[PDB]
Amino acid sequence: LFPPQWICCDIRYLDVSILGKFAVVMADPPWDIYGTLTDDEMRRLNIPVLQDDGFLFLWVTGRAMELGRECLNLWGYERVDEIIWVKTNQLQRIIHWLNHGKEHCLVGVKGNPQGFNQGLDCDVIVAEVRSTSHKPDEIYGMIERLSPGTRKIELFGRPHNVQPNWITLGNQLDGIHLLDPDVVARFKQRYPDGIISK
Amino acid sequence: NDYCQHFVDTGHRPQNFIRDVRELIRLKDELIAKSNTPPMYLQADIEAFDIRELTPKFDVILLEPPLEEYYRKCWTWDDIMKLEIDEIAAPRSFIFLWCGSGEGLDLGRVCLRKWGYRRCEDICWIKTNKNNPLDPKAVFQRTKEHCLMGIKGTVDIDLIITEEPEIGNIEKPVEIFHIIEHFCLGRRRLHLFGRDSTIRPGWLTVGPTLTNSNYNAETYASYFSAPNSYLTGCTEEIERL
Ligand SMILES: CC1(C)CCN(Cc2ccc(N3CCOC4(CCN(c5cc(NCc6ccccc6)ncn5)CC4)C3)cn2)CC1
Numbered sequence: 001l002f003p004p005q006w007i008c009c010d011i012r013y014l015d016v017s018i019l020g021k022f023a024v025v026m027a028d029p030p031w032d033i034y035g036t037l038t039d040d041e042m043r044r045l046n047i048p049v050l051q052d053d054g055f056l057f058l059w060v061t062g063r064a065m066e067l068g069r070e071c072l073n074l075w076g077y078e079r080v081d082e083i084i085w086v087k088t089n090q091l092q093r094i095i096h097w098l099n100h101g102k103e104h105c106l107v108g109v110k111g112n113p114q115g116f117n118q119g120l121d122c123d124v125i126v127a128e129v130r131s132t133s134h135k136p137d138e139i140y141g142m143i144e145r146l147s148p149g150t151r152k153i154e155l156f157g158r159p160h161n162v163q164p165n166w167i168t169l170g171n172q173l174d175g176i177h178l179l180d181p182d183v184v185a186r187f188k189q190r191y192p193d194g195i196i197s198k
Numbered sequence: 199n200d201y202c203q204h205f206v207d208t209g210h211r212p213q214n215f216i217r218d219v220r221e222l223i224r225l226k227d228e229l230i231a232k233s234n235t236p237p238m239y240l241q242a243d244i245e246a247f248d249i250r251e252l253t254p255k256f257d258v259i260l261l262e263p264p265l266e267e268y269y270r271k272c273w274t275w276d277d278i279m280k281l282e283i284d285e286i287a288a289p290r291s292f293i294f295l296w297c298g299s300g301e302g303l304d305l306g307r308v309c310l311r312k313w314g315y316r317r318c319e320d321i322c323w324i325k326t327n328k329n330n331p332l333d334p335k336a337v338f339q340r341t342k343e344h345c346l347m348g349i350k351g352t353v354d355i356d357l358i359i360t361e362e363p364e365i366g367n368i369e370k371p372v373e374i375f376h377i378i379e380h381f382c383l384g385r386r387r388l389h390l391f392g393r394d395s396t397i398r399p400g401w402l403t404v405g406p407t408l409t410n411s412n413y414n415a416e417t418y419a420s421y422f423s424a425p426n427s428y429l430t431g432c433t434e435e436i437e438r439l
Pocket residue numbers: 009010011012028029030031034035036037059060061103132133134135136156157158169170171172
């Protein structure tokens with residue numbers, strides 16, 4: 001169901017098998033480099049159930065450039081692209097050994113996606129920095145042009161991240177808001193009292 | 199303004215719209231120039247060459263293997279990974295590996311770890327197309343290349359922005375040398391797979407297409423013998439006599 005949907009939850013503990021399959025997964029994890037996940041908690045995320053054929057977008061910084069590649073492969077993806085976001089101010093000027101002018105987003109593929117519009121966009125985003133850790137909205141447009149109309153899921157999103165065609169998971173979202181009947185049905189049997197524990 | 203949408207609409211890459219791309223750096227550039235060794239260079243077929251003949255051990259290695267993706271004798275990541283770079287790197291030393299934009303971003307990291315380095319920066323060469331507005335695995339148009347910085351042992355930004363060079367021009371932006379030299383990492387600097395066109399003061403260049411050589415291991419080592427063994431390349435020369 002087209003309009004934005006979301007689930008406030010601990011992504012470590014949610015049974016994501018209730019959500020079905022997605023053409024695109026995006027994650028902006030709180031890598032251990034407020035609350036973070038240990039390297040083991042990241043490895044153990046049940047990403048493999050979320051897709052059969054499609055793309056994963058994984059934001060990485062620092063040593064998660066390497067840990068993120070490890071998770072990508074462990075979860076069953078091959079890294080096939082790497083987007084960089086060049087961070088500018090409102091006037092298009094770029095904001096340990098080097099100053100950092102960019103953030104990286106790994107692009108992984110699982111299976112054999114068919115019917116995606118590969119090559120419409122290029123792999124550099126130029127866009128203004130906003131609040132701390134706020135990714136640029138351009139990424140949603142690139143993903144929509146890549147795979148228009150399909151179901152997508154964002155991990156570790158915040159309220160400003162909710163978008164049509166997306167289900168957003170994160171622990172600072174406001175409650176549960178589900179509209180897809182297949183998801184509502186599976187959520188109700190799995191969580192009859194609406195509590196997501198253990 | 200969504201420059202991704204704009205690129206879809208017009209073909210102008212988003213990096214075409216980045217603008218403007220203390221001083222003090224001019225003096226530092228001058229100290230670098232004063233301490234630079236004479237350019238040294240050696241024609242060598244690196245696939246058949248025993249790189250251990252390259253002495254002494256280097257403070258900085260710039261590695262630019264000719265990848266097939268650059269053309270649209272080429273080196274595969276199989277070939278590159280089998281170079282024994284660890285055999286010529288100083289115990290404390292740095293590497294800058296041009297990795298391209300495809301599987302090299304992964305295989306180049308395997309190489310760094312194989313040779314004993316850890317990656318500390320990822321330097322992106324972003325190519326504009328102001329003048330002229332696909333890999334089967336690619337999801338997006340590839341408009342950049344990565345140069346990975348590795349360290350072993352105990353003013354610039356990680357971006358280089360220039361226009362995409364003409365077809366068949368495989369040269370990398372000379373700005374990479376500026377970044378490397380501004381780190382003040384030491385004076386024994388090796389550029390593997392360099393060319394006549396990349397020869398530079400302060401560097402030893404080794405590669406298959408060089409037309410001339412002047413490398414002599416004893417002469418080269420004499421540039422770093424005492425009292426000059428530990429200079430950073432960013433300090434005044436030490437008074438002789
Ligand atoms: C600049 C860019 C493009 C973007 C920023 N990236 C870095 C980055 C990424 C993320 C954040 N976030 C800020 C906060 O909230 C979020 C999302 C909700 N969230 C959890 C966590 C959880 N389980 C573990 C857990 C652990 C302890 C206690 C309880 C639960 N389960 C569900 N959601 C915690 C994280 C996001 C901030 N910066 C760089 C590149």
